Each structure stands twice: as C-alpha cells, then as structure tokens.
Scaffold this active site. Sequence first.
Site, PDB file in Angstrom:
ATOM      1  N   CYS A 280      -1.244  13.076   1.829  1.00 34.95           N
ATOM      2  CA  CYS A 280      -1.892  12.956   0.531  1.00 34.95           C
ATOM      3  C   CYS A 280      -3.396  13.125   0.701  1.00 34.95           C
ATOM      4  O   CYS A 280      -4.026  12.405   1.485  1.00 34.95           O
ATOM      5  CB  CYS A 280      -1.559  11.611  -0.107  1.00 34.95           C
ATOM      6  SG  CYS A 280      -2.270  11.344  -1.734  1.00 34.95           S
TER       7      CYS A 280
ATOM      8  N   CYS B 265      -5.832  10.179  -0.199  1.00 37.19           N
ATOM      9  CA  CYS B 265      -5.738   8.991   0.640  1.00 37.19           C
ATOM     10  C   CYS B 265      -6.800   8.951   1.733  1.00 37.19           C
ATOM     11  O   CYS B 265      -7.036   7.883   2.306  1.00 37.19           O
ATOM     12  CB  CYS B 265      -4.343   8.896   1.261  1.00 37.19           C
ATOM     13  SG  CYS B 265      -3.053   8.370   0.113  1.00 37.19           S
TER      14      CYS B 265
END
EC number: 1.8.-.-
Lengths: 64, 90, 384, 114, 43
Positions: free
Chosen positions: D37, D40
């Site tokens: 991700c 993140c």
Amino acid sequence: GFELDKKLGRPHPFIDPTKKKQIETTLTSDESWWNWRKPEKEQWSRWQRRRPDVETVFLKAMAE
Amino acid sequence: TEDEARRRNWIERGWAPWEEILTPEADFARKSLNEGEEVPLQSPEAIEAFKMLRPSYRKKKIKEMGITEDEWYAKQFEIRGDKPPPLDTS
Amino acid sequence: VDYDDGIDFPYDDPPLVCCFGAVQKEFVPVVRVHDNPMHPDIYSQWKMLQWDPPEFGRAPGGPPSNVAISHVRLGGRAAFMGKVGGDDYGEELVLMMNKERVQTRGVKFDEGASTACTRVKIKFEDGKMKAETVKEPPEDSLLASELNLAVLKEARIFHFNSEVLTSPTMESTLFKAIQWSKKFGGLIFFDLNLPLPLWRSRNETRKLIKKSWDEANIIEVSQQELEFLLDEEYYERRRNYTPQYFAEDFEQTKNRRDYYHYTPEEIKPLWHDDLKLLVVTDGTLRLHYYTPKFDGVVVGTEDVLITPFTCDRTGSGDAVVAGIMRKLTTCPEMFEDQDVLERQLRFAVAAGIISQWTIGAVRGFPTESATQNLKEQVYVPSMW
Amino acid sequence: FVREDYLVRKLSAQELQDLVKGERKVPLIVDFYATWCGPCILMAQELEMLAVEYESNAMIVKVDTDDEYEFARDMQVRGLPTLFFISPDPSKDAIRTEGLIPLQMMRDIIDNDM
Amino acid sequence: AEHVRAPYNGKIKFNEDLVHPTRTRHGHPAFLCYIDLSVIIES
C-alpha cells in the site's frame, strides 16, 4: 485573383489551383517490391507529432 | 569425401534433404547472392526470381500458364528430387 | 418525488457530475492478501511493490472525492455530496476540495461530530478479538434531508462507490439520492471499489450489491472484482491451463500475459436492462467494455519503471473513472458508436497512466492537456 | 551499542489480544498496514515521528494485514491506512480513524480522548 | 558515394528495359544503369 496576388505579393497558393493536376495512380503494393510497400499497420514513430514552435502560434494568430 | 560424409550424416545424424518452401524474397536472395554482391544478374534463374518479386508479374505468368492461383500455391508444396520405386506388396 | 427545486437555468458547460460518498485522504478501500511482502519496517523497499504490484492493486481506486478532483483537473465540473464534521480535519478536507475547484455546496457540516473518526467497542467473541460500531463517522451519516436537490438536478452523472453499502444510513441516503437523480434525468455511475469486508464471500457481496447494481447505468469494476463476482476459481484455473502437447495457434507459444476478454454470455448474470456501459479494467493495460449492442477491449499500457523513485499507483483507477466521465459528459456518441467509444477510452487510459507517476493520489492527478499529450504520444495518429 | 532505527513494533493478532486484555497505563495506538500500500509509507513515517514524540506516554504498534487479514476484517477495517486508538480505561470505547490523518490530529486524539 | 534525391513529389516514369536488375549491398532489388538514363517525375 491569381497572377495578380502572385505579382503583388498578396497571400496566394504557391501552386495555382486551376493549373494543378493529380499524380495519377501509382503502384498498389501488388506490383511493388517488398522494400517499397506501405506497412499494413501504422508504425509508432516518436516523430508522429509535429514539433511546436513560435512560428506556428504566431501564424495561427495572424490567420485569425 | 563429400559422398561418404553425406551418407554418415543421413545414417548417424538423421539428415534428409527436406523441401524448403520459400517466399519469392527468400528464393531471390538465394538465387541472386550466388552471383555476387552488386553485379548485373546474368543467370536466368536469378532474372526470373527478380521478376517474381512482384506478385502482379506472378499473377500474369500463371494466367499465361492458364491455371488458377490456388493450386499454384499447392504446386509449391511438391516433393522434389527422385521418387522411390513403387511398392509391390505380394 | 413530487415537485422540482430552485429555478430552471440553461446550465453552464461542461455538464456537472456529482460524486456521492465519503471524502477521505488516500485510503485505498480494496484490500486483499498478497503473497510477496517486503520488510515490515524498511518502507524504502515498499516501492518495489509499486512496480511489481498485487493484481488487485494495479490501478487502485479511492474515495469519490478523488474522482471529483481528477474530473475537475481533466477539464470537467464536479460537485461532491457528503458530510464532514465541524472540526479542523473536516474544514481541511473541504478546503482541499475547494482549492481543486470542486463544488462543495453539497457538503453538509456536523458541528458535533469528529471527521473521519468512528466509535467502536472491542469484544472477545469465541476467543477472537472483534469490534462493533458504536457511533458512525460523519462521512457515513448523511441524511436524506441533508441532500442538495439543486446539485442532483444539475448533475448529469451520479457517481458513488460500494463503500456506502457498508453503512445503513448512507445506503438509505444513497437510494433516495439515486431516486432524485433519476427523476431529473441524470445517469448513475457505479464504481464498485469493494472494501475489505466485501471480499469475504461471493454470494453475500452479490446480495449486498444487487440493488445498487441494478440501479446503475454505468458500472466500472476491476478484473479481480468481476472475477470474484462471477467465479474466482474457474478463471484462476483457466489462466493456469497449459496445453500438454502443442499449442492451438502460434500466438499461444509465446507465453504472453493473459488478457482474456470475457464473453457477454459470461457477463449475462450481471447484466440488466438499464445498463448502458460496463467497463472492466485490468489496470491501465486493458479496458474491456460491454454495451447492449457490442463489446470489445481497448489495449493500453503502463510504465512505472520509467520513474522508479516517484511511481505510485494510488489514484490511477480514480483517474480512469474521471476520464471516462469526462468523455461521457461531452461525447454522447460513446454509448452508441464503438470506434468513438474506444477512441475516447484511450483518453482515460492515458489519464490512468500519468496518475501512476507521482506519489499521492490527489497530488498526481493529470490535467487535460497532459493527458491528451500522452495519448497522442503513446498511440499512432490513426488511433486518436 | 547501535540504537534501533524503528520504534514502532509489529505484533501478531494473538499478541495484540494479550496486550489489549492486560492492564494498560498509557494509550495504545494500533496501526493496520500493508507493504504493497502506497499511503502506508507516509503513515509509517508519521507513526515513527509520533512514537518519538510520545516516549513512554503512549504505545504504538502495527499489524500487517497480509498476516492478520481475518483479524483485521473482524476489527472492522475497511481499508488502509487504518488506526485504532485504544484507551487504557476498559469502560471507554476505542476510536478508529481512516485515511492519512495529520500528526496533530493524532496528538489531539491521544491527549483529549484516551 | 553521392545520393540522387527526388526534387519533387510525383510519379516516377522510366523504362525498366534499359536497366539491368541487381541486388544492393543492403539486400534490396534495384536497377543498374550504364547509360544516360532519363527519369520523369510527374509532379
């Protein structure tokens, strides 16, 4: 029209449209060698777009 | 010598002169490079190969020979060389 | 329902679109399990999963605010419909949407709510820790009385995601808003973007999304979403199949990446009468489109390796959807002409390609000029 | 002799369950993340800064959703990045924040809600 | 080596029986010329 705009330098086509002829019919890739045949599919070039410059913009503005 | 080497290739290495069905371009390349690099082609096979580079000439030639294009294409896939003796299965 | 709202006006161009849902920063909803994790602490390695991504995250989508911002950057006019709190974060989100020239007249403030905050209680059912929602966040708490009927009247496309289906209040508000939008002549754009809960099982998600699926005129799903909704194992087996002795054609010998185009017979379970366009996106590489008359695929590409240190795929699907809406609002012939449809979908392909070159979804949304330049550079002039 | 570069510790679902069950004096901040991700990474840096700020007055932990996917789904995680602010008082209720929220927002939540 | 370039857009008109077929060093079919050949471009 022509023959007067060309004399005076007024905007006119370089080739007179009336004194203009087509270029007949050329080889159809069936009576041509392999190296002179148009490719079946269009080929990506990286030169397929015309380069921008000052002259094009100014000419378009002056034509407007 | 080049009679026993060929036999040894056939026997020990599986060699066989299989027919290479070529395009007019490959046929012209084989027939014309046997003369030279940039020379006026003189061998009649090379001249014919040069003429066959245009499929229109081939169509006119086959029309003169009075045969259709389909079996002329099928005429390409003909087994070359000598033929084996027929079979007498007694 | 009964009457109209406001004053009738000729309305300015380009036609307005409405994005319904939550306004959030980043927050990719689609989450699945990936088998190639990087170092748990060293985030400098995590960019390697941006140029070798999980298939479900090849062109991730996000909140509807991303789609609205991208649509405005591509030359369109968009309005966002949703609720934020009256705290600093809600004002920050509304300011972000305002600086991007997204209409926030449809944004409802709640002075007593904390933006993007949810109250939950932690429980230990059957020996496993779990949570349950106590108070929903203001982004999931928009009421049908808080809608903006002028926006729903002017908007020509109504856009929403399946994240609102995870909230009952937002579900009821969504269906009322869809009723209002269909009354005034707008089109319903369902951009699935299945969140983490909705990947649990096929039948449960089908039952959860069937009503909103049938209320949509335009639907965009990813390849993974479509295959999950139809049958995951069947297509997984089909991809893994290899002929035992010889290939059935020369192209099968090259072991190329699989770009299987689903037949409309396979799409038949998910088709309904009001569906004008279904788009299945394999990232930016493939755009499978389905209409009641015809179907096909638009071949695209991607290159995140051209900029290994700035590439980020977040927001690429939002850019694709925004480009689709941008071309739909100005080219009605897309729904009826296949060649025009593919030519206009190449624009969305280019928009998705550019969006992968920047860190951050909002930060990297392309403009219309850059998108058209990339489209003309990538494709040959006959495909423009 | 060499200090560690990261202060946020990664825990399993079972370890997090034990941590929540046990007596807690300082607020517990649980991070759900995945290495694939993009957002993140920024959340990871922000949480490292937050852990530096709250030396012993808070506990910052992270859970990978590629190892605890079912646990994340049970905890009502709808996407990434997702944070859970768990108060030391069992009577109070935890707060779930979704998105790349500012560091000042985290400070406000920790100070005035835990 | 000097290259003759077409000065106008047009149709090439010449008799191919006054030239001898050959093969260039680049592998292309071509005509060798040993005479004062006249080539017509119908512009």
